[PDB]
Amino acid sequence: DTAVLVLAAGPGTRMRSDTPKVLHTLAGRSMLSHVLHAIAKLAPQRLIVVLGHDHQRIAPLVGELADTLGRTIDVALQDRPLGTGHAVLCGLSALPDDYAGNVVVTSGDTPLLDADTLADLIATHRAVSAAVTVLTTTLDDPFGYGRILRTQDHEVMAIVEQTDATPSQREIREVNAGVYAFDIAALRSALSRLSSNNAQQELYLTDVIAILRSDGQTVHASHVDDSALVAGVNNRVQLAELASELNRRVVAAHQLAGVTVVDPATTWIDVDVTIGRDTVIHPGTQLLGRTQIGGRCVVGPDTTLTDVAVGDGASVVRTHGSSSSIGDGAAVGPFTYLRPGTALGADGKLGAFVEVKNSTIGTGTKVPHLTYVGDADIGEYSNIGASSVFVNRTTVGSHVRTGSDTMFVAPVTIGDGAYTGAGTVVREDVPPGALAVSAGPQRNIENWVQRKRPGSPAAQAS
Amino acid sequence: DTAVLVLAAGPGTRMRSDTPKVLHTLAGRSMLSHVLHAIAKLAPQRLIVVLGHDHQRIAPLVGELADTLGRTIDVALQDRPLGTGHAVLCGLSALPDDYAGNVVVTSGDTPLLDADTLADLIATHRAVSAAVTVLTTTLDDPFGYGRILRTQDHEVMAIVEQTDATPSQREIREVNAGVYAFDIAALRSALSRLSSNNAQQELYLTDVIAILRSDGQTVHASHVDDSALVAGVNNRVQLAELASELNRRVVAAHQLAGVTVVDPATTWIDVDVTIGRDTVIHPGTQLLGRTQIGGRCVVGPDTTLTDVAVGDGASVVRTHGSSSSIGDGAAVGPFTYLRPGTALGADGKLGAFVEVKNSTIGTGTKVPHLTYVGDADIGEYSNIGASSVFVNRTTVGSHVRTGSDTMFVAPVTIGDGAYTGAGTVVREDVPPGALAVSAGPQRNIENWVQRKRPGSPAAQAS
Amino acid sequence: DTAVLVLAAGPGTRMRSDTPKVLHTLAGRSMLSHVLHAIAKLAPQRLIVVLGHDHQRIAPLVGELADTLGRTIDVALQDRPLGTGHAVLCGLSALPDDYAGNVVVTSGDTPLLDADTLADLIATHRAVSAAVTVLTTTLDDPFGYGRILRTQDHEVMAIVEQTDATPSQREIREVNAGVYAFDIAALRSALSRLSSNNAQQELYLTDVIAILRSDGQTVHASHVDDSALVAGVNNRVQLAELASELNRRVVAAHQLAGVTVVDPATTWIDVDVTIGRDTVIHPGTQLLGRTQIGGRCVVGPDTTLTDVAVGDGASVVRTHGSSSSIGDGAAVGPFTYLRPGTALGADGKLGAFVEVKNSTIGTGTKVPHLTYVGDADIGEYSNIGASSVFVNRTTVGSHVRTGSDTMFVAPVTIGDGAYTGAGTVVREDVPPGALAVSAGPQRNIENWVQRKRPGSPAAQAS
Ligand SMILES: CC(=O)N[C@H]1[C@@H](OP(=O)(O)OP(=O)(O)OC[C@H]2O[C@@H](n3ccc(=O)[nH]c3=O)[C@H](O)[C@@H]2O)O[C@H](CO)[C@@H](O)[C@@H]1O
Ligand SMILES: CC(=O)N[C@H]1[C@@H](OP(=O)(O)OP(=O)(O)OC[C@H]2O[C@@H](n3ccc(=O)[nH]c3=O)[C@H](O)[C@@H]2O)O[C@H](CO)[C@@H](O)[C@@H]1O
Ligand SMILES: CC(=O)N[C@H]1[C@@H](OP(=O)(O)OP(=O)(O)OC[C@H]2O[C@@H](n3ccc(=O)[nH]c3=O)[C@H](O)[C@@H]2O)O[C@H](CO)[C@@H](O)[C@@H]1O
Ligand SMILES: CC(=O)N[C@H]1[C@@H](OP(=O)(O)O)O[C@H](CO)[C@@H](O)[C@@H]1O
Ligand SMILES: CC(=O)N[C@H]1[C@@H](OP(=O)(O)O)O[C@H](CO)[C@@H](O)[C@@H]1O
Ligand SMILES: CC(=O)N[C@H]1[C@@H](OP(=O)(O)O)O[C@H](CO)[C@@H](O)[C@@H]1O
Ligand SMILES: [Co+2]
Ligand SMILES: [Co+2]
Ligand SMILES: [Co+2]
Ligand SMILES: [Co+2]
Ligand SMILES: [Mg+2]
Ligand SMILES: [Mg+2]
Ligand SMILES: [Mg+2]
């Protein structure tokens, strides 16, 4: 039996942001979302999130996530950010007076923390019958972390915060993860004895360690060797570092499953994205949101896709696209913009300098050059000429061949197998197999240039 | 006298690919190509490649490479992938029964291995009269490598594979490169004594080390300090790591020879690419295949060129281009697509949102905006107006000035010094110094807006 | 009282460049500019730059910088590059014979050196009454640096250059920064005793250390723990390394002040660039020159801006732009090119495949697709149709709606609230609230396709 509390009520001042800290994102989820996902998977009996000043703007998001994960998640309010020890006091208040399970505590700013790490913590805590078990790790750069103080016998004595530590204690590289398990009665007892006489004038959860040690209670540290899993984020430098570590891991998972990723460092892949076997992803690419790529695709370089579905054997090269689907074998890019509601059929082509918005494009249809397609439905095996505009519904049939520089003034229907001539402005329906035209005939004005541009390079050349 | 065997007949299952492992690429060559290049340079008397199941799809590539490098390269077949010791047995069978030279063995998945490392190995082997000499290195992360076992006296005892090693042996950081020299008679003798009773149930080449030691034969390890040269690739994570290490080295070679590379980490340069002095390469750039850049060019950011020749003092900025030539002083980009067969003369310009395919563009000619040029030949000092389409042969002369929004309906010829008006559809030849036109005259419809868009922001503004 | 000499007269041969070494750039300033900025801030009584062969091409730049920093900076000439000891002799000659202040020496190729490091040096020098104080640091890779030689008692004995050091001395990791303070009389004395009998046959400033030690003078090393501040650049590999270190620092400063930078490694930010709170910068972005970004902007991915001003709450996505302004709330990109003199009003939009040059675009005006706008002034709340060309002054009023595929043949004026039809060539003024047109009427040719493309997929479909 376990209750997990998530401390998410600090001001977040070191982020320097008007967006609450725990709402900042990496890999397509907010830090609080990452932490709640890992905990839902652990499936404890209770899950409490302590919220503070910005609670109006965070609580609804927590309720959406409770729905999403199919479990209830309570919110305890912490009126003023008096310290992590005080946040835990506020959290405990959402539990019955007589609750008797373990209490696990973690921060909203430790977003790589995973279900396994949490499980192992609870198992260690129970195995050594500890009044408190604290996760620790060891870091080349421990700046900002509580330092682990040990006796000569390697027994944990205390946690000292970066603001309170001596120059000498600051060299300690073993750090507090800020992830704990507690005996409830011992935790309640230690919290009632915290005082705020320290360099931040705050009630430190970390003092509970020396307090329980005081009482001769069992204090156990558990060393997490993979430091990333328990790394924290207090500012945007640390946010981008952990986002980059998490992104290397996501990419590695894909590479081990069969995806070529030419340059992991410049390939950003959100956590829910799936990618098929033998796809090759070229440098400078972001795959975001619920993007799904099939097998044997080529993607990038310099492509950004957010919520885009791509079939098998497609090419999507230098493409900026969102909320769109791209069929098997289709070719998109280079220099192609897909706006929401774009559906391109199998073996379709959208070429260079083409933008599509809210349009359906049938199997085998090509829009290869300098064209805008908006609010239109186009059939199968059609060909849209270069430098054209769908001026915006318009329906174009199958096996149509439209000429370069055609404007389609919505709404108009072009029948199956119809053609338009180059330079046509289409303002009315075109029957199946008809040719629509409107450009006037060419006229040559002889020797114009000698007359109107006399002594010019063009005049001398003629 | 030396025979080199290349073991390339394993299944490659950890790549998770339908393309044989040794055919995966980095820096524009397959791993097997890299390994055969380094060995051809060493120029041994014999060169044998052991191939397995996918031999149908690899052997032809080996024959093309034998042709390319001007030497014969035999292929020995290994029916079933029974282990590296068994692959070497299959390899030896392509040698005469009575062969008496040294036998060098290396893997197809060690692609940074170079001629010098191989030479030094053979020199060390001969100098210490070893029955076997094995290349080793030392690594922070030795996962997956055979560990070097040494006695108290630093004498090499054995090689233990990652699957077979104790937790304690796994901490050993000195690893087997999988590159060896052998006395032939000792190698034949040791191979006939391998058994497959180990964690992979395979015949391990690595066991030969403890077997020859058994017989009191001389076993010598040679430490390669530059670990990269002997790094292996068993999966796509390791492939991208070694591709990135190799790319840093290629870029560094260019920087030391006089190329500014603003961001090595995001500049990918294939091994055959040459680049002239005082060129500056901006971030996000890939130079691929047989690309050649002259001196004092500016290239990037975000440019990909495959098989592109660029003269001296050209600019090629945000350009995606292949199999094309760009003359001295020419300017291309930003946002420019070159398809195969593009030839742009000296001081030519191809601007933003211009795509060219299979066209010749003469000295000093500019195509600056939103235009497609396909299957066309254009002369010197001409100017193609914005938003135009070559609708596809068409020949345009020198000193021509064509107006914006001209469609050139192939095939048509435009004489030297000719003009077209804006909005012209050109369907017939235009004489030298003539002006071709087809747009109708402008008509203004007064107060249309008050009538047809009454109470609109446009109506109120008028 | 202090004189600072900057040695900038070496040939720079290891750069392999026709641009003098000290003129190569990182983060938008030349190395010599970086070094002179840091020294001006220290504000010593005298500032002397020693220049050599390329002095004609460097001295004017030094005079511009003296003006910029509001102080005089003398130039001493060093006829032939006889060595750093000889450069300092040439430098001293720009001082009075009887000068009595401290002499600080530094290189033009140490460009992260900052005012604080210099101040601390002078303070240490004066505090220990040293005849010479040398800055040192310690490096994993000390290749190319003079090695610090110490006695058993940790007293500094000598500096040995990489070319002159034994294999064993080469393992020394503590290096000479090439930054010194001197007693003037001791420096003059030691310089007159240098000889050039060493591996480079040069007069080494570094020998002065062992010479003053010889005379029983006080020699003090001061260890700089942040090695970057004193790192040198002798070749383009080292230039890009230090440019990348400096760029991480600039980005970090922005992240700590409130800027989200998703990928520091692929975000390049020049030193004078300012960026507002809660802006998000996406990967592959360069912000160059005097670029200024306001708050809550979104910038990138793949955007390059040089000297661009962007208001608050704007979006500038996949944009290549220079010397332009973008108003509050405006939207630019993806795939947008801004050339110098572009001014886009608040809430304006420049869309995909749009290039603007030397044009003013008023509040709320949209140019969303495939258009070139050159040398034009456009009013407020207007809408420019897709695939249009300003053929280049032209003035367009407010609340205008122009139709797709309009060519505006400069110079023309379009009144407030005017419209043009799709496919119009505008060659004369259009009154306020008028509609201008020129395209001919559509004609459908029935069954053309069965007649002219018989048995085609289009013919069968009809
Ligand atoms: C005193 C303390 O605990 N310090 C720990 C805290 O430092 P650190 O300084 O990171 O602690 P923070 O200021 O980030 O606050 C901890 C978390 O608890 C929440 N919160 C904070 C204050 C408050 O009054 N109410 C509240 O709910 C915040 O949402 C925050 O996410 O985590 C580090 C690891 O990341 C540990 O090494 C430190 O030992
Ligand atoms: C038992 C053995 O040798 N292990 C070595 C092998 O491990 P490793 O596990 O990498 O060996 P692999 O499975 O990659 O096979 C070695 C190479 O030989 C070829 N091959 C393999 C099996 C086979 O039955 N037939 C065949 O021809 C494959 O093409 C492969 O490229 O290389 C490592 C370095 O990269 C060394 O540290 C290991 O000591
Ligand atoms: C002999 C000497 O001093 N070596 C130092 C020099 O090596 P390093 O080999 O880098 O010295 P350089 O060749 O770069 O020359 C030093 C600087 O002085 C100027 N210059 C050089 C030669 C000359 O004849 N005239 C002249 O004015 C150059 O502009 C150059 O920027 O800096 C290193 C750190 O960067 C130190 O570790 C070395 O101890
Ligand atoms: C071809 C065309 O007329 N496109 C229009 C059209 O673009 P959308 O792609 O629907 O957002 O509506 C816009 C007004 O929202 C206007 O700015 C633009 O000119
Ligand atoms: C200006 C023009 O008509 N371009 C054509 C033309 O492009 P290419 O660039 O030749 O591949 O042929 C294509 C059919 O292969 C067609 O899809 C496209 O519309
Ligand atoms: C729409 C138009 O006619 N643009 C012209 C025009 O471009 P600028 O953007 O002004 O540089 O002048 C150029 C001659 O300098 C010519 O190459 C091009 O065709
Ligand atoms: Co924190
Ligand atoms: Co291997
Ligand atoms: Co130097
Ligand atoms: Co037109
Ligand atoms: Mg704080
Ligand atoms: Mg295996
Ligand atoms: Mg030198």
Side-chain angles (χ1 to χ4, degrees), chain C residues 64-337:
Chain C
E64 283 157 45
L65 289 165
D67 286 349
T68 279
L69 297 157
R71 84 175 316 305
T72 39
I73 307 177
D74 309 300
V75 169
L77 293 176
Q78 185 204 12
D79 225 15
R80 282 155 308 117
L82 305 165
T84 52
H86 182 88
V88 170
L89 265 174
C90 290
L92 294 178
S93 86
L95 291 167
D97 297 331
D98 72 14
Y99 193 72
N102 310 304
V103 176
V104 167
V105 175
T106 188
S107 295
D109 60 7
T110 298
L112 266 62
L113 181 67
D114 62 7
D116 280 346
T117 307
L118 290 168
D120 284 354
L121 163 64
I122 293 170
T124 302
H125 186 65
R126 288 182 189 161
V128 295
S129 305
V132 53
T133 310
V134 57
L135 293 196
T136 72
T137 191
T138 144
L139 289 182
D140 302 323
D141 192 0
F143 185 67
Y145 284 93
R147 304 302 203 288
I148 311 298
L149 291 192
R150 279 185 202 258
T151 48
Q152 307 80 350
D153 19 316
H154 308 134
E155 274 191 350
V156 179
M157 219 32 52
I159 297 167
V160 61
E161 296 296 290
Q162 172 81 39
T163 55
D164 297 80
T166 65
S168 168
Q169 289 171 328
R170 293 175 175 155
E171 304 279 319
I172 297 165
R173 282 152 48 266
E174 186 190 9
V175 294
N176 173 34
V179 187
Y180 310 82
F182 291 106
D183 174 70
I184 191 158
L187 171 61
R188 290 192 190 273
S189 174
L191 292 174
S192 70
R193 282 132 76 202
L194 297 167
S195 68
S196 62
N197 58 307
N198 45 52
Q200 291 170 240
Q201 287 287 152
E202 269 190 30
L203 294 172
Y204 291 160
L205 181 61
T206 49
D207 278 349
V208 142
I209 277 68
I211 292 164
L212 296 174
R213 152 83 17 173
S214 223
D215 293 355
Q217 294 277 25
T218 306
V219 176
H220 199 247
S222 185
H223 192 87
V224 175
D225 298 340
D226 186 1
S227 296
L229 299 179
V230 285
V233 175
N234 288 337
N235 62 43
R236 281 195 221 230
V237 171
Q238 293 186 329
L239 177 53
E241 288 282 26
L242 207 37
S244 164
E245 178 56 29
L246 176 55
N247 188 69
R248 289 177 200 105
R249 289 177 189 220
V250 172
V251 169
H254 293 290
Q255 296 173 299
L256 291 179
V259 177
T260 291
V261 175
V262 170
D263 187 5
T266 68
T267 309
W268 287 88
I269 304 174
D270 278 0
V271 293
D272 285 341
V273 166
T274 55
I275 298 166
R277 173 193 179 92
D278 283 327
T279 313
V280 178
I281 307 300
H282 284 103
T285 291
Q286 309 92 45
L287 304 173
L288 298 182
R290 313 263 296 122
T291 288
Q292 298 181 338
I293 308 295
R296 303 164 272 107
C297 290
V298 172
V299 184
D302 296 338
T303 281
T304 304
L305 301 178
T306 302
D307 295 339
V308 177
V310 184
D312 296 321
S315 215
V316 192
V317 167
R318 290 185 186 266
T319 291
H320 199 79
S322 65
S323 301
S324 285
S325 60
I326 301 174
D328 290 353
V332 178
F335 311 108
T336 303
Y337 183 24

Side-chain angles (χ1 to χ4, degrees), chain B residues 24-359:
Chain B
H24 295 240
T25 53
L26 54 167
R29 316 202 161 131
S30 69
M31 295 201 289
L32 179 54
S33 175
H34 278 116
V35 165
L36 293 178
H37 278 84
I39 297 155
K41 239 242 93 33
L42 179 81
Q45 164 186 76
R46 316 275 318 253
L47 181 25
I48 295 139
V49 180
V50 182
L51 293 182
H53 188 242
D54 313 280
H55 76 268
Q56 205 93 37
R57 202 226 299 209
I58 299 162
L61 302 164
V62 168
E64 283 157 45
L65 289 165
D67 286 349
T68 279
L69 297 157
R71 84 175 316 305
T72 39
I73 307 177
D74 309 300
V75 169
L77 293 176
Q78 185 204 12
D79 225 15
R80 282 155 308 117
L82 305 165
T84 52
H86 182 88
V88 170
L89 265 174
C90 290
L92 294 178
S93 86
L95 291 167
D97 297 331
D98 72 14
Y99 193 72
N102 310 304
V103 176
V104 167
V105 175
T106 188
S107 295
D109 60 7
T110 298
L112 266 62
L113 181 67
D114 62 7
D116 280 346
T117 307
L118 290 168
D120 284 354
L121 163 64
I122 293 170
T124 302
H125 186 65
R126 288 182 189 161
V128 295
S129 305
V132 53
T133 310
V134 57
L135 293 196
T136 72
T137 191
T138 144
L139 289 182
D140 302 323
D141 192 0
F143 185 67
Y145 284 93
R147 304 302 203 288
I148 311 298
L149 291 192
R150 279 185 202 258
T151 48
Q152 307 80 350
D153 19 316
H154 308 134
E155 274 191 350
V156 179
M157 219 32 52
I159 297 167
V160 61
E161 296 296 290
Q162 172 81 39
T163 55
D164 297 80
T166 65
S168 168
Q169 289 171 328
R170 293 175 175 155
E171 304 279 319
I172 297 165
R173 282 152 48 266
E174 186 190 9
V175 294
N176 173 34
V179 187
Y180 310 82
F182 291 106
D183 174 70
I184 191 158
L187 171 61
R188 290 192 190 273
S189 174
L191 292 174
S192 70
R193 282 132 76 202
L194 297 167
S195 68
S196 62
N197 58 307
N198 45 52
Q200 291 170 240
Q201 287 287 152
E202 269 190 30
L203 294 172
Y204 291 160
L205 181 61
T206 49
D207 278 349
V208 142
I209 277 68
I211 292 164
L212 296 174
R213 152 83 17 173
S214 223
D215 293 355
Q217 294 277 25
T218 306
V219 176
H220 199 247
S222 185
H223 192 87
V224 175
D225 298 340
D226 186 1
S227 296
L229 299 179
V230 285
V233 175
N234 288 337
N235 62 43
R236 281 195 221 230
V237 171
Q238 293 186 329
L239 177 53
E241 288 282 26
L242 207 37
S244 164
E245 178 56 29
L246 176 55
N247 188 69
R248 289 177 200 105
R249 289 177 189 220
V250 172
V251 169
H254 293 290
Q255 296 173 299
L256 291 179
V259 177
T260 291
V261 175
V262 170
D263 187 5
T266 68
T267 309
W268 287 88
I269 304 174
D270 278 0
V271 293
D272 285 341
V273 166
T274 55
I275 298 166
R277 173 193 179 92
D278 283 327
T279 313
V280 178
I281 307 300
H282 284 103
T285 291
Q286 309 92 45
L287 304 173
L288 298 182
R290 313 263 296 122
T291 288
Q292 298 181 338
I293 308 295
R296 303 164 272 107
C297 290
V298 172
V299 184
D302 296 338
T303 281
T304 304
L305 301 178
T306 302
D307 295 339
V308 177
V310 184
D312 296 321
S315 215
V316 192
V317 167
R318 290 185 186 266
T319 291
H320 199 79
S322 65
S323 301
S324 285
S325 60
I326 301 174
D328 290 353
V332 178
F335 311 108
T336 303
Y337 183 24
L338 313 178
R339 284 160 75 197
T342 294
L344 174 66
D347 304 324
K349 183 177 177 70
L350 298 175
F353 327 119
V354 173
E355 168 176 335
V356 182
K357 176 231 169 182
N358 198 30
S359 293

